[PDB]
Amino acid sequence: TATGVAITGSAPAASMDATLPAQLPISAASVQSTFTLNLKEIEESKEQVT
């Protein structure tokens, strides 16, 4: 703050500035996927599909 006193005044009241946190958490979850393909399908798809 900045207030106005007289020239022969008496030094007005105290005031400082301020900061604040944010803390923004991330560490719980994930985005995942599976697909579970077979081992015999990867041979009968090289001479089956054009």
Partner 1 sequence: AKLNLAVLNNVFSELLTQEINRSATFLGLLSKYPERKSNIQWGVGMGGT
To partner 1, the closest distance from the beta carbon of 15 in angstroms equals 7
Nearest distance in Å: CB 26, partner 1: 18
Distant-in-sequence, close-in-space partners of 11: CB < 8 Å, separation ≥ 6: 5
| 16 binds partner 1 per the rule CB under 8 A | yes
User: Among 3-11, 12-20, 24-32, 34-42, which window interacts with partner 1 (CB under 8 A)?
Assistant: 12-20
Of 17, 22, 24, which is closest to residue 2 (Cα–Cα)?
17
49 scored as a contact of partner 1 (CB under 8 A): no
